[PDB]
């Protein structure tokens, strides 16, 4: 039956073809105890989001960043059933995130509570929420004012975050604006929000046996062969660029997810230039949607092309 899995995954390449890799599993690796934080020092707030397996909650953490100082954090946890398989899925995400290291454009792990109670993973709080809702909130406030350089900066930062994950040998299997968070200074951060989401919350995911597939964000090789590489993420990134430069419009607007959608993608269908994009930004998008993954740009390339335009 269906299990919890972070959409952030470490991988190891075993050859030079796209399907020659496997997924790194931390279940047999040991958890580093220097990350352990006392549960007594967490004061819980609202539910940020709730899924089938668990939820993410706002909280106040005493002494996590500096001595004597309370800050706001976000806490992943399981729901009370506490099935032991789901427990280890969440330990594996913990161990994985402890090995990543931090980066400005990733929602970083701060600590965890694992010994005297139910498992908590503790993350940086991002006050303005997911990028998708943020962009949508600012449709009637675009020149609280949102400008074109802000949009370009968001694009640059997400690419920067993905460069980090590439260099650390990770992929994100669900890169989209709903999984990017916004915080002070127009700063954006890639996260894995999957534990806080359901099938009721989202029609952008298609049920298919065990899988829950974000079809309109997926590269052809992901859709047709089940392959997720960093070049798949470049496709997804293109789709996320379209989201940014339309202020959060659903991709392939008005087109439903069905067998005809699979055919569109197979035959080379690509979205049009959205309102807030320049022609140069649309040329970037279009090359992210190269059918052949070798023709797509890399995240170092995109970090340059968008370092320039700023
Ligand atoms: C205030 O909104 C947030 C703030 C926030 N800060 C951290 C996180 C988070 C989410 C997942 C994993 C790790 N961290 N987080 C999530 C949200 C959030 C809640 N709902 N939506 C749509 C975004
Ligand atoms: Cl996710
Ligand atoms: Cl959501
Ligand atoms: Cl989902």
Say whether 76 counts as a known binding-site residue.
yes
Residue 145: CB atoms within 10 A of its CB come to 8
Mark which of 65, 100, 127 sits at the end of a domain: 127
Resolution in A, one decimal?
A: 2.5
Whether 219 contacts 232, CB under 8 Å: yes
> Are 121 and 76 spatial neighbours (Cβ–Cβ below 8 Å)?
yes
Which atom, in ligand 1's list, is nearest to the CA of 133? Answer: 22
Going from the C-alpha of 256 to that of each of 135, 197, 213, the distances in angstroms are 23, 21, 14
Distance of CA 133 to the CA centre of its chain: 15
Residue 13 Cα to ligand 3 midpoint, Å, equals 31
What the block records as the tokens of 268 is: 């080379």
- CATH number of the domain encompassing residue 164: 1.10.510.10
Residue 178, CB-side half-sphere exposure with 13 Å CA sphere:
18
- 121 and 138 share one domain: no
C-alpha 9: how far from chain center: 11
- Beta-bridge partner residues of 267: none
Domain boundary among 58, 93, 127: 127
Q: Contact, 292 vs 231, CB < 8 A?
A: no
Q: Report residue 229: phi and psi, to 5°.
A: -125, 180
Report the DSSP pairing between strands 120-124 and 109-113. antiparallel
148 token code pair: 């074109």
Q: Pick from 67, 101, 127: which residue ends a domain?
A: 127
Catalytic residue among 130, 174, 192, 233: 174
Please choose, from the candidates 249, 228, 245, the residue with its C-alpha nearest in 3D space to the C-alpha of residue 284: 245
Q: Which residues pair with 62 in a beta bridge?
A: 70
Q: At what angle do helices 299-309 and 148-167 cross, to 10 degrees?
A: 160
202 included as an active-site residue:
no
Task: Quote the crossing angle between the two packed helices 230-244 and 299-309, to the nearest 10°.
Answer: 30
Q: What was the experiment behind these coordinates?
A: X-ray
Q: Alpha-carbon Rg of the chain, whole angstroms?
A: 19
Q: Measuring CA to CA, which residue among 34, 100, 32, 37 is closest to residue 64?
A: 37
Give 241-297 as a DSSP string.
HHHHTTTSPPSSTT--SSHHHHHHHHHT--PPPPTT--HHHHHHHHHHT-SSGGGSP
Ligand 1 site residues (CB inside 6 A) read: 48-49, 56, 74, 76, 107, 123, 125-126, 129-130, 181, 191, 193, 196
Ligand 1: nearest atom to the Cα of 128: 1
| CA distance linking residue 151 with residue 145, whole number of Å | 12
DSSP 3-state of 192? coil
Contact 248, 177 (CB under 8 A): yes
Residues 114 and 181 both lie in one domain: no
The DSSP secondary-structure symbol of 150 reads H
Identify whether residues 159 and 123 lie together within a single domain. no
Distance CA 62, CA 40 (A): 9
Give the CA-trace dihedral at 81, 82, 84, 86, to 10 degrees: 100
How far, in Å, from the CA of 140 to the mean position of ligand 4?
Answer: 29
Q: Is residue 50 a known part of a binding site?
A: yes
- 56 among the known binding-site residues? yes
> Ligand 1: which of 4, 7, 49 to mutate, judged by most atoms within 8 Å of the beta carbon?
49
3 state DSSP class of 110: strand
Q: Are 57 and 45 in contact (CB under 8 A)?
A: yes
What tokens were used for 219?
A: 């590269």
Q: Torsions phi, psi of 258, nearest 5?
A: -160, 180
Q: Is 55 annotated as a binding residue?
A: yes
CATH value at residue 88: 3.30.200.20
Residue 269 CA, ligand 2 centroid: distance in Å: 26
78 plus 212 within the same structural domain: no
Gap between the Cα atoms of 176 and 135, Å rounded: 13
Q: Which domain holds residue 81?
A: 1-127
How many angstroms separate the alpha carbon of residue 279 from the centre of ligand 2? 30
Cβ contact 290:132 at 8 Å: no
**Is 265:294 a contact under the CB 8 Å cutoff?**
no
3-state secondary structure of 75: strand
User: Do 166 and 255 reside in the same domain of the chain?
Assistant: yes
Give the chain's domain count: 2
Q: Which residues of 254-287 are buried (b: 16+ CB within 10 A; e: fewer)?
A: eeebeeebeeebeeeebbebbebbeeebbebbeb
Three-point CA angle 70, 71, 72, nearest 5°: 135
What phi, psi does 87 have (nearest 5°)?
A: -60, -50
The position carrying tokens 């659903």 is: 250
Closest-approaching ligand to the CA atom of 137: 1
Look-up: residue for tokens 């055919």?
Answer: 263
How many Cβ atoms are within 10 Å of 84's Cβ, its own excluded? 6
Tell me: do 154 and 273 sit in the same domain.
Answer: yes
Question: What's the rounded Cα separation, in Å, for the pair 109 and 64?
Answer: 11
CA distance readout (Å), 204 to 48, 102, 133, 242, 251: 20, 30, 15, 16, 10
| Ligand closest to CA 107 | 1
Taking the C-alpha atoms of residue 178 and residue 123, their distance in angstroms, rounded to an integer, is 17
């Amino acid at each position: 039956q269906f299990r919890y899995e972070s959409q952030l995954q470490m991988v190891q390449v075993t050859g030079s073809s796209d399907n020659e890799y496997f997924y790194v599993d931390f279940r047999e690796y040991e958890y580093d105890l220097k990350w352990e934080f006392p549960r007594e020092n967490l004061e819980f707030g609202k539910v940020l989001g709730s899924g089938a397996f668990g939820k993410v909650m706002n909280a106040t953490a005493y002494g996590i960043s500096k001595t004597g100082v309370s800050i706001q954090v976000a806490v992943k946890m399981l729901k009370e059933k506490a099935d032991s398989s789901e427990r280890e899925a969440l330990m594996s995400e913990l161990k994985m995130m402890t090995q990543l290291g931090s980066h400005e454009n990733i929602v970083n792990l701060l600590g965890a509570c694992t010994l005297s109670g139910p498992i908590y993973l503790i993350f940086e709080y991002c006050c303005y929420g997911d990028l998708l809702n943020y962009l949508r909130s600012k449709r009637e406030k675009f020149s609280n004012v949102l400008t074109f350089e802000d949009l370009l900066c968001f694009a640059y930062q997400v690419a920067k975050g993905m460069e980090f994950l590439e260099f650390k040998s990770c992929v994100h299997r669900d890169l989209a604006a709903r999984n990017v968070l916004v915080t002070h200074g127009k700063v954006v951060k890639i996260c894995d929000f999957g534990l806080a989401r359901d099938i009721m919350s989202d029609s952008n995911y298609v049920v298919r046996g065990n899988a829950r597939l974000p079809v309109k964000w997926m590269a052809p090789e992901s859709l047709f062969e089940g392959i997720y590489t960093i070049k798949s993420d470049v496709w997804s990134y293109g789709i996320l660029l379209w989201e940014i430069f339309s202020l959060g419009v659903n991709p392939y607007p008005g087109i439903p997810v069905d067998a005809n959608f699979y055919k569109l993608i197979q035959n080379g269908f690509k979205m049009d230039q959205p309102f807030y994009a320049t022609e140069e930004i649309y040329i970037i998008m279009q090359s992210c949607w190269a059918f052949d993954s070798r023709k797509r740009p890399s995240f170092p390339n995109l970090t340059s092309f968008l370092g320039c335009q700023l």
